């Protein structure tokens, strides 16, 4: 016992003291130092986490290799096991494996935060299969979350593994030799002659026991009851880290070959209750390759689950058992298990019994027929009869890895060769708190015929039977009621099609008759060409990648976490507000005093400078007397380890006395609370306007808020000196200047006395323009008062509930316009929901309004701005900034005219664009309008005109299923609004041999940045870029800098360097002269004997800004970037879900500096846009406390999730004379664009509604953002959406 | 190391801008700051850095009179903010060559 | 006979032959190119404090 | 060295010549190898550059 051995990257491990509380990732960091795997959420959803796993199996003796989420996986399970990680694969310090050389070669990774995990995904597959399918390249990535490349660059690298300009060359990749593998560990192979023995670890609290025979699992478990069994953690993991569990003894019976075995019996296939999905998803597949189709229709409903289970990760740990026995009222499996009587086979010392799963297996909420003694040894999928039909349908939020929101098993047994029901089973998982059968509604069924009838009946019955109360948990009682209804309804049309033969249906049902189905990708980009004649050398204009791509591909990139810590470095642990509105009446930490480890707890006493922080001094540090929101930081734990203090943080108690508290933007509103006094700017003659306008259009709009998720959560690092209040600090940050001041002006000590220092951010998207400040100012604190140098790295739980997110907008218009569809009039008054705090909330309110005319001409508009002062965690800035709303709000109105006119809507919008000299509303006149020509070629490469007919067509023959197709276009204000700002320093030094050395007041977070610097200074001093070097941002180089926002960052931080690049070459000519045919190298050693500088500044402030809302002038941008996007959806009208089937994108980045960063960032910020008005979507209760806090309930976009056919391409001949090197700027505008998605489903909408619902083919129906599968499926009203007062009205 | 190089050189940058050395720090000496630097030797570190300090603060001094003209009685702090606002650069090299 | 004799730390990044040093003496110029020539990396790789 | 240590920083003491003037014929480390805590012995074998 005691002794846990495994291997990590060949190199043996022997841990003599295994805690059974520690997880992979955190000994793999900690205890190996090992920093390529990253922590990205913790609950298993984003795959940063991603390792390999090799063992011996014995049964196929035989080596088997899969994938696990390091943050799940204790170490206690891995015993005898060889890990891999990134690092063990390859590096830049040696080679890079063909993987790793391919991702980041393909422009596949960007922050790369995301990149080591999903590089050991596509490890892992390779190791499984050498030359994998184009689809089951696509399938290892089902546990995998990227936020910055919309995917589709990751997935064209890895597409030379199956089986004008370019991005990258697949011939120059290197080819993948597994004869040249890491072997698997040699000793570890001999050791799997042993028998294996009983372990024993005793961790801080728990004690884990790795049986090794069934007979000792009885005994175990026999000797202790209350004991938990533990096989692959994904369930008892999140139980312990989020739901504040201990279960003090744990049991894994995983080595025990009963719990393994499979067999296949006359009634159906066995499986042992270790036996991991992904081995029976494997085992079941091969079973219906090889049996009859009707002998296999409960597995292929089996399967049908498997393949939205989760992910491989996921799928390679999880046992069959632990999905039944925790009792999940969303488990999927269980719903398929009841309906089809699987046969459960439970033990105990001494008795034995089995019995087939029915409705009185889960008593009661997570409870099962177990005893305590007893524990699932097997179960048996049954084998398929004849007259015997099943079906299994699941529907979420996000098709990819999700929780369901009613999932079932569905089975049917009719008399020999009849229609005639003999057994009937509907089982549902999301109606309940525990796994129901719809008895009631199935008994009525018995003997009845399979017809428009049964279907008639049963969807009353499931009506009445599964009714949901108002209070319902979970809410969406609508759509969930209606999903039984049509799922029913689709196993309705499923068995009559089967019980059609073949060796029927109507014509446009059979559609709905069939399982999800992914069409072949196929991808296109196109960029310009670099003149024929530019120097090899002058990389601007070239597709070069990422400078850190292979680091980040590496785990070499080293992010703030990674850093090493100090001997005596503490942690520390924010400790939050759980009311949304209240008094503090008194703190105790009685009880975090007791954790082990504990050093102090801080508050807003403890600091020295003042409370007083954030952008308007209107926030504190720590909050005093009243909390004003639900996560908003009373104080802070600090403890010896990440653990201890966030134990200790957990326990300490405050007592509130609630204040009357305003949620929502009405109450607002209502309460009259808002920031600051409204916001406005208006044109023309309104009352004129309508007075003159055909038709008028009145209505009201919301978009949901959004999370930036970037992959790394926010993190500091304080190290205090000891001498003059001087610290350091190692930031995730956008904005180290704010840093600087706000942590200076807590402390109370002189800005120079603090240094911030930004390597790089995994992810920024705003989330980091300013809220990164709530956290190092508390680490300060706790360094200030230790001494010691502090860290904390929010989890993404904390992060999603403190950072803030994007703005939530509510829209209150009205249109009027001509027959024609020209508008005439325009009045949209906008509301945000701003936070307990200011923040940025105004400034995003005004790029908002400079924002509501998108790209259209409007003669009479007004548009009005409040800011919402709610008791909702302070939201920020977002990619976008307030832009995208106004966009949507914008094209919302316009879709609206394009319908009550009865005109083609690219039709309305062309007629209404803008045009080359006109004037915004913001009077600002358009130069170099290129919309048009965006316009022109989409429309063509598109081919928009010839695929609406093939969508009408479609939604002719097509009954259950609707397609839509929607041109959207966009421009973008260039410059921040806040003038001021348009600053941008740099420091350059040229070293005596000739190294440069390069520092901006610009910081990375995968944008490629400080890339598109070296590119800059390397095409300015005339050198390679190999001499160029940019390590870092730091205060102390180039201070008082703006934040990294407003896409600007490359057109002022690109001007410095510029500038600083002239000022050396003007210092060294007098020696290139002297020296004509000498090297750059000789020039530079002449200039430093000459005693001449090689060290100067750069700076640049843009010309001619400054807007006054007073006067409605001034210019508010320095120019505009535009882009249209084309995109055409596909619905199921019976579900909610949808695929994106193709997107086309042309953007005027005008000459762009690097076509490969640029275009990444359009399909990146596409990406992010579709997800913000169809994907994403955060949910709070009435009080305010958020309920989504982790991807497993916040879907971003996944792999699966972007359109089909990605098509990109970036308009030709167009250079922007207003910034450097005739480049526009590229971050945010193209996020918009992802509305096309929305409008697209919007359309094909109106085609269900005009296919079941009102004949009114000018109907105007709201969607709100986003247009979650909920919004959709309600919109598309039928007899199931559809389907007793005493007296009435009349 | 001991001769209070850094205290000097505090000095006369607190009689080139004309504040008190209690607004001024020197923090260390870095090679990403300063790149090339001859080693602190040859008794002319004073001389030599004095110099260079000196000019730097000229150069700061020459880019913030415009705001100190506009605001005779103004503060330091009012005129650095005023710099910061119109977006002049508060950031300047110093060198000097014997 | 300086009270504190000579002293050196060396912290390795791990990226791009990276290193930061926190050196006793009076020559960082001479610390930087020398670690340089050493480990055979661009004299901007290396920061000496 | 009043700079606080990492958790991972590892200590250096060199090795020199004990004779004025001489060839190096060979050099044993069996006997460090053996001192617990010992990482490894560096020699001009091991630098890069
Ligand atoms: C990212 C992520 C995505 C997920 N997606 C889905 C999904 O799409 N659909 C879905 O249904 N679930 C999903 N889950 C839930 C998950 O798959 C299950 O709870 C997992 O199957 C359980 O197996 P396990 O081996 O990990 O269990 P464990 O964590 O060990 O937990 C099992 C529980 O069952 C008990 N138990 C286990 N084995 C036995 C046995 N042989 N005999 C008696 N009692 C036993 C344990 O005591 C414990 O209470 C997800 C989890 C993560 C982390
Ligand atoms: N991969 C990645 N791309 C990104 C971000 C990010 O955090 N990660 N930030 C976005 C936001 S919000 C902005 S304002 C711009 C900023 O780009 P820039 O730094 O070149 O000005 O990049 C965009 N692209
Ligand atoms: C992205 C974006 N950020 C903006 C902004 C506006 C005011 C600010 O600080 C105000 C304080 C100093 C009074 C800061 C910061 N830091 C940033 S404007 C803008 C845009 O896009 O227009
Ligand atoms: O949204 Mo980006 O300006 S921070
Ligand atoms: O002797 Mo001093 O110049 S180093
Ligand atoms: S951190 Fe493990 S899946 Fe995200
Ligand atoms: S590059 Fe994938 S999450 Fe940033």
Redesign the interface.
């Given at each position: 016992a005691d002794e846990l051995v495994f291997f990590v990257n060949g190199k043996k491990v022997v841990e003599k003291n295994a805690d059974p509380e520690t997880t992979l990732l955190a000994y793999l960091r900690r205890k190996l130092?090992l920093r390529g795997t990253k922590l990205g959420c913790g609950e298993g959803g984003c795959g940063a986490c991603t390792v390999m796993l090799s063992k011996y199996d014995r049964l196929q003796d035989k080596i088997i290799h899969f994938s696990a989420n390091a943050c799940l996986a204790p170490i206690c399970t891995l015993h005898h096991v060889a890990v891999t990680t990134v690092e063990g694969i390859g590096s830049?310090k040696t080679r890079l494996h063909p993987v790793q050389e391919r991702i980041a070669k393909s422009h596949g990774s960007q922050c790369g935060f995301c990149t080591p995990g999903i590089v050991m995904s596509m490890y892992t597959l390779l190791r499984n299969q050498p030359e994998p399918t184009v689809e089951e390249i696509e399938d290892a990535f089902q546990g995998n979350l990227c936020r910055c490349t919309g995917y589709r660059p990751i997935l064209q690298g890895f597409r030379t593994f199956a089986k004008s300009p370019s991005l990258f060359n697949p011939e120059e990749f290197m080819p993948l030799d597994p004869t040249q593998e890491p072997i698997f560990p040699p000793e570890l192979l001999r050791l799997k002659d042993v028998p294996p023995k009983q372990l024993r670890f005793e961790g801080e609290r728990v004690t884990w026991i790795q049986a090794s025979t069934l007979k000792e699992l009885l005994d175990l478990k026999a000797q202790h009851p209350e004991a938990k069994l533990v096989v692959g953690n994904t369930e008892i993991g999140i139980e312990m880290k989020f739901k504040n569990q201990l279960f003090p003894m744990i049991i894994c019976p995983a080595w025990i070959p009963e719990l393994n075995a499979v067999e296949h019996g006359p009634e159906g296939i066995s499986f042992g209750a270790a036996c991991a999905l992904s081995s029976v998803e494997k085992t079941l597949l091969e079973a219906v390759a090889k049996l009859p189709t009707q002998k296999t229709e409960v597995f292929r409903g089996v399967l049908e689950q498997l393949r939205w289970f989760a992910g491989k990760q996921v799928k390679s740990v999880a046992s069959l058992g632990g999905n039944i026995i925790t009792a999940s009222p969303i488990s999927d499996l269980n719903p398929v298990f009841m309906a089809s009587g699987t046969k459960l086979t439970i033990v105990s010392r001494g008795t034995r019994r089995t019995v087939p799963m029915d409705h009185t297996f889960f008593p009661s909420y997570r409870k099962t027929l177990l005893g305590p003694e007893e524990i699932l040894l097997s179960i048996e999928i049954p084998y398929s009869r004849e007259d015997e039909f099943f079906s299994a349908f699941k529907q979420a939020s996000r098709r990819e890895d999700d929780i369901a929101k009613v999932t079932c098993g569905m089975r049917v047994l009719f008399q020999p060769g009849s229609m005639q029901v003999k057994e009937l089973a509907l089982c549902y998982g999301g109606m309940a708190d525990r796994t129901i059968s719809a008895l009631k509604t199935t008994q009525k069924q018995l003997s009845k015929f399979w017809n428009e009838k049964l279907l008639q009946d049963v969807c009353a019955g499931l009506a009445e039977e599964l009714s949901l109360s108002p209070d319902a948990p979970g809410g969406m009682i609508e759509f969930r009621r209606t999903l039984t209804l049509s799922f029913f309804f689709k196993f309705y049309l499923t068995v009559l099609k089967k019980l059609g033969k073949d060796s029927k249906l109507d014509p446009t049902y059979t559609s709905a008759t069939l399982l999800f189905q992914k069409h072949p990708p196929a991808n296109i980009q196109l960029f310009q060409e670099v003149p024929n004649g530019q120097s090899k050398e002058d990389t601007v204009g070239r597709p070069l990648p990422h400078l850190?791509a292979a680091?980040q591909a590496s785990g070499?990139?080293?992010y703030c976490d990674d850093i090493?810590?100090?001997?005596?470095?503490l942690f520390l642990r924010l400790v939050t507000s759980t009311r949304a509105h209240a008094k503090i009446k008194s703190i105790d930490v009685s009880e975090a005093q007791k954790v082990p480890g504990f050093v102090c707890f801080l508050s807003a006493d403890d600091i020295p400078g003042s409370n007083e922080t954030g952008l308007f001094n209107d926030e504190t540090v720590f909050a005093k007397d009243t909390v004003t929101c639900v996560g908003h930081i009373i104080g802070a734990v600090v403890a010896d380890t990440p653990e201890h203090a966030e134990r200790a943080a957990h326990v300490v108690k405050v007592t509130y006395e609630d204040l009357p508290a305003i949620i929502t933007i009405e109450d607002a509103i209502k309460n009259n609370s808002f920031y600051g006094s409204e916001l406005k700017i208006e044109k023309g003659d309104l009352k004129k306007g309508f007075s003159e306008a055909d038709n008028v259009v009145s209505g009201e709009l919301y978009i949901g808020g959004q999370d930036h998720f970037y992959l790394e959560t926010h993190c500091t690092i304080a190290i205090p000196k000891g001498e003059?209040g001087?610290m350091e600090l190692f930031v995730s940050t956008q904005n180290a200047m704010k840093t600087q001041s706000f942590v200076a002006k807590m402390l109370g000590v002189?800005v120079?006395?603090i240094?911030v220092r930004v390597k790089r951010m995994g992810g920024g998207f705003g989330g980091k323009e300013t809220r990164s400040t709530l956290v190092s100012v508390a680490v300060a604190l706790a360094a200030y008062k230790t001494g010691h140098?502090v860290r904390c790295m929010l989890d993404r739980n904390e992060d999603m509930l403190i950072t803030g997110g994007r703005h939530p907008f509510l829209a209150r218009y009205k249109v009027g316009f001509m027959k024609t569809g020209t508008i005439v009039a325009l009045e949209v008054d906008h509301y945000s929901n701003a936070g307990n705090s200011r923040d940025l909330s105004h400034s995003i309110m005004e790029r908002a309004l400079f924002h509501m005319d998108n790209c259209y001409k409007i003669p009479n508009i007004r548009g009005t701005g409040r800011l919402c002062k709610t008791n909702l965690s302070s939201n920020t800035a977002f990619r976008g900034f307030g832009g995208p709303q106004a966009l949507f709000i914008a094209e919302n109105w316009m879709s609206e005219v394009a319908v009550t006119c009865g005109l083609p809507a690219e039709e309305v919008r062309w007629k209404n664009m803008y045009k080359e000299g006109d004037l915004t509303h913001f009077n600002q006149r358009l130069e170099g309008f290129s919309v048009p020509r965006c316009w022109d070629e989409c429309l063509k490469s598109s081919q928009y005109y010839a695929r609406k007919s093939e969508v009408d067509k479609f939604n002719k023959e097509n009954c259950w299923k609707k397609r839509g197709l929607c041109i959207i276009p966009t421009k973008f204000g260039i410059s921040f609004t806040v003038?001021?700002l348009?600053?941008a320093?740099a420091?350059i030094?040229?070293?005596?041999?000739g190294?440069?050395?390069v520092?901006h007041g610009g910081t990375e977070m995968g944008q490629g940045l400080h890339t598109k610097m070296v590119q800059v200074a390397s095409k300015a001093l005339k050198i390679p870029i190999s001499?160029?070097?940019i390590?870092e941002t730091s205060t102390?180089?180039?201070?008082?800098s703006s934040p990294t926002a407003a896409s600007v960052s490359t057109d002022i931080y690109g001007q410095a360097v510029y500038e600083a690049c002239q000022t050396i070459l003007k210092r060294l000519e007098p020696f290139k002269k002297k020296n004509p045919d000498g090297s750059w190298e000789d020039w530079v050693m002449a200039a430093?004997q000459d005693?001449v500088?090689?060290?100067?500044?750069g700076?640049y402030?843009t010309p001619n800004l400054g807007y006054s809302f007073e006067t409605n002038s001034g210019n508010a941008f320095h120019y505009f970037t535009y882009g249209v996007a084309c995109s055409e959806v596909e619905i199921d009208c019976l579900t909610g879900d949808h695929k994106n089937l193709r997107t086309d994108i042309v953007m005027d980045v005008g000459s762009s500096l690097n076509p490969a960063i640029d275009i990444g960032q359009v399909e990146g910020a596409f990406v992010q846009g579709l997800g913000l008005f169809t994907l994403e979507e955060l949910h709070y209760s009435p009080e305010g406390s958020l309920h989504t806090r982790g991807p497993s309930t916040y879907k971003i976009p996944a792999f699966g999730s972007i359109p089909t056919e990605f098509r990109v391409s970036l308009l030709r001949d167009c250079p922007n004379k207003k910034a450097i090197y005739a480049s526009k700027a590229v971050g945010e505008p193209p996020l918009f664009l992802g509305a096309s998605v929305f409008f697209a489903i919007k359309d094909a909408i109106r085609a269900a509604r005009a296919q079941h619902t009102n004949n009114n083919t000018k109907e105007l129906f709201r969607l709100d953002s986003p247009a979650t599968p909920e919004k959709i499926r309600n919109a598309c009203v039928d007899k199931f959406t559809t389907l007793k007062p005493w007296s009435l009205r009349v």
């Amino acid at each position: 016992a005691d002794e846990l051995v495994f291997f990590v990257n060949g190199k043996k491990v022997v841990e003599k003291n295994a805690d059974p509380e520690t997880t992979l990732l955190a000994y793999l960091r900690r205890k190996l130092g090992l920093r390529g795997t990253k922590l990205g959420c913790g609950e298993g959803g984003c795959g940063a986490c991603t390792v390999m796993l090799s063992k011996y199996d014995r049964l196929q003796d035989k080596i088997i290799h899969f994938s696990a989420n390091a943050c799940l996986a204790p170490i206690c399970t891995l015993h005898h096991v060889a890990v891999t990680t990134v690092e063990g694969i390859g590096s830049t310090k040696t080679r890079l494996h063909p993987v790793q050389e391919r991702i980041a070669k393909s422009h596949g990774s960007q922050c790369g935060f995301c990149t080591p995990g999903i590089v050991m995904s596509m490890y892992t597959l390779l190791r499984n299969q050498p030359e994998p399918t184009v689809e089951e390249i696509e399938d290892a990535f089902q546990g995998n979350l990227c936020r910055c490349t919309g995917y589709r660059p990751i997935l064209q690298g890895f597409r030379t593994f199956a089986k004008s300009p370019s991005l990258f060359n697949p011939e120059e990749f290197m080819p993948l030799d597994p004869t040249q593998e890491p072997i698997f560990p040699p000793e570890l192979l001999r050791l799997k002659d042993v028998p294996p023995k009983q372990l024993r670890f005793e961790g801080e609290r728990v004690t884990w026991i790795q049986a090794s025979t069934l007979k000792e699992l009885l005994d175990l478990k026999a000797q202790h009851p209350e004991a938990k069994l533990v096989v692959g953690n994904t369930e008892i993991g999140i139980e312990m880290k989020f739901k504040n569990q201990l279960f003090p003894m744990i049991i894994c019976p995983a080595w025990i070959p009963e719990l393994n075995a499979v067999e296949h019996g006359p009634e159906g296939i066995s499986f042992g209750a270790a036996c991991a999905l992904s081995s029976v998803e494997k085992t079941l597949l091969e079973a219906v390759a090889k049996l009859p189709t009707q002998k296999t229709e409960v597995f292929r409903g089996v399967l049908e689950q498997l393949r939205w289970f989760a992910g491989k990760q996921v799928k390679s740990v999880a046992s069959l058992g632990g999905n039944i026995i925790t009792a999940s009222p969303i488990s999927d499996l269980n719903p398929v298990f009841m309906a089809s009587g699987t046969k459960l086979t439970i033990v105990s010392r001494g008795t034995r019994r089995t019995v087939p799963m029915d409705h009185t297996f889960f008593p009661s909420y997570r409870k099962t027929l177990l005893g305590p003694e007893e524990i699932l040894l097997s179960i048996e999928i049954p084998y398929s009869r004849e007259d015997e039909f099943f079906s299994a349908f699941k529907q979420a939020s996000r098709r990819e890895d999700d929780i369901a929101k009613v999932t079932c098993g569905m089975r049917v047994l009719f008399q020999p060769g009849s229609m005639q029901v003999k057994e009937l089973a509907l089982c549902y998982g999301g109606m309940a708190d525990r796994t129901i059968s719809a008895l009631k509604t199935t008994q009525k069924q018995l003997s009845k015929f399979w017809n428009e009838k049964l279907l008639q009946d049963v969807c009353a019955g499931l009506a009445e039977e599964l009714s949901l109360s108002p209070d319902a948990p979970g809410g969406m009682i609508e759509f969930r009621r209606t999903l039984t209804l049509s799922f029913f309804f689709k196993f309705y049309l499923t068995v009559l099609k089967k019980l059609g033969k073949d060796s029927k249906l109507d014509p446009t049902y059979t559609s709905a008759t069939l399982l999800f189905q992914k069409h072949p990708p196929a991808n296109i980009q196109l960029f310009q060409e670099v003149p024929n004649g530019q120097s090899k050398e002058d990389t601007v204009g070239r597709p070069l990648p990422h400078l850190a791509a292979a680091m980040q591909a590496s785990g070499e990139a080293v992010y703030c976490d990674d850093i090493p810590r100090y001997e005596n470095e503490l942690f520390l642990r924010l400790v939050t507000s759980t009311r949304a509105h209240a008094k503090i009446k008194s703190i105790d930490v009685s009880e975090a005093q007791k954790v082990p480890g504990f050093v102090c707890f801080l508050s807003a006493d403890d600091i020295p400078g003042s409370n007083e922080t954030g952008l308007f001094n209107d926030e504190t540090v720590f909050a005093k007397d009243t909390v004003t929101c639900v996560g908003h930081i009373i104080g802070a734990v600090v403890a010896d380890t990440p653990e201890h203090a966030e134990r200790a943080a957990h326990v300490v108690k405050v007592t509130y006395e609630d204040l009357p508290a305003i949620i929502t933007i009405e109450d607002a509103i209502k309460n009259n609370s808002f920031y600051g006094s409204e916001l406005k700017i208006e044109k023309g003659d309104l009352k004129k306007g309508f007075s003159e306008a055909d038709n008028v259009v009145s209505g009201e709009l919301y978009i949901g808020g959004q999370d930036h998720f970037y992959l790394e959560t926010h993190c500091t690092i304080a190290i205090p000196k000891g001498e003059e209040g001087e610290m350091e600090l190692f930031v995730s940050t956008q904005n180290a200047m704010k840093t600087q001041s706000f942590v200076a002006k807590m402390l109370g000590v002189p800005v120079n006395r603090i240094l911030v220092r930004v390597k790089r951010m995994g992810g920024g998207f705003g989330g980091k323009e300013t809220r990164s400040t709530l956290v190092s100012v508390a680490v300060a604190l706790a360094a200030y008062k230790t001494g010691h140098p502090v860290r904390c790295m929010l989890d993404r739980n904390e992060d999603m509930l403190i950072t803030g997110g994007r703005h939530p907008f509510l829209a209150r218009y009205k249109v009027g316009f001509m027959k024609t569809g020209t508008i005439v009039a325009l009045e949209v008054d906008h509301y945000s929901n701003a936070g307990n705090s200011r923040d940025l909330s105004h400034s995003i309110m005004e790029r908002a309004l400079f924002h509501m005319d998108n790209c259209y001409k409007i003669p009479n508009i007004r548009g009005t701005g409040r800011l919402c002062k709610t008791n909702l965690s302070s939201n920020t800035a977002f990619r976008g900034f307030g832009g995208p709303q106004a966009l949507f709000i914008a094209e919302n109105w316009m879709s609206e005219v394009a319908v009550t006119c009865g005109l083609p809507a690219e039709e309305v919008r062309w007629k209404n664009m803008y045009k080359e000299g006109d004037l915004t509303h913001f009077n600002q006149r358009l130069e170099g309008f290129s919309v048009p020509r965006c316009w022109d070629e989409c429309l063509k490469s598109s081919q928009y005109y010839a695929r609406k007919s093939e969508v009408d067509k479609f939604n002719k023959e097509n009954c259950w299923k609707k397609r839509g197709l929607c041109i959207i276009p966009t421009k973008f204000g260039i410059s921040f609004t806040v003038p001021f700002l348009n600053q941008a320093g740099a420091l350059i030094h040229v070293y005596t041999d000739g190294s440069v050395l390069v520092s901006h007041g610009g910081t990375e977070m995968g944008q490629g940045l400080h890339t598109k610097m070296v590119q800059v200074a390397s095409k300015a001093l005339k050198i390679p870029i190999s001499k160029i070097y940019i390590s870092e941002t730091s205060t102390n180089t180039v201070p008082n800098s703006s934040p990294t926002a407003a896409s600007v960052s490359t057109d002022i931080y690109g001007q410095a360097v510029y500038e600083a690049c002239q000022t050396i070459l003007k210092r060294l000519e007098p020696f290139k002269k002297k020296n004509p045919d000498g090297s750059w190298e000789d020039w530079v050693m002449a200039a430093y004997q000459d005693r001449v500088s090689l060290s100067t500044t750069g700076f640049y402030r843009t010309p001619n800004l400054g807007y006054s809302f007073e006067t409605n002038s001034g210019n508010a941008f320095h120019y505009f970037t535009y882009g249209v996007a084309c995109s055409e959806v596909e619905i199921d009208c019976l579900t909610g879900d949808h695929k994106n089937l193709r997107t086309d994108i042309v953007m005027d980045v005008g000459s762009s500096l690097n076509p490969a960063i640029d275009i990444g960032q359009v399909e990146g910020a596409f990406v992010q846009g579709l997800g913000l008005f169809t994907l994403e979507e955060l949910h709070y209760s009435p009080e305010g406390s958020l309920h989504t806090r982790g991807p497993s309930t916040y879907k971003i976009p996944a792999f699966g999730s972007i359109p089909t056919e990605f098509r990109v391409s970036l308009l030709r001949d167009c250079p922007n004379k207003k910034a450097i090197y005739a480049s526009k700027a590229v971050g945010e505008p193209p996020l918009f664009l992802g509305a096309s998605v929305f409008f697209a489903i919007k359309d094909a909408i109106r085609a269900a509604r005009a296919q079941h619902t009102n004949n009114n083919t000018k109907e105007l129906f709201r969607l709100d953002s986003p247009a979650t599968p909920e919004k959709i499926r309600n919109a598309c009203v039928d007899k199931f959406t559809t389907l007793k007062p005493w007296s009435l009205r009349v």
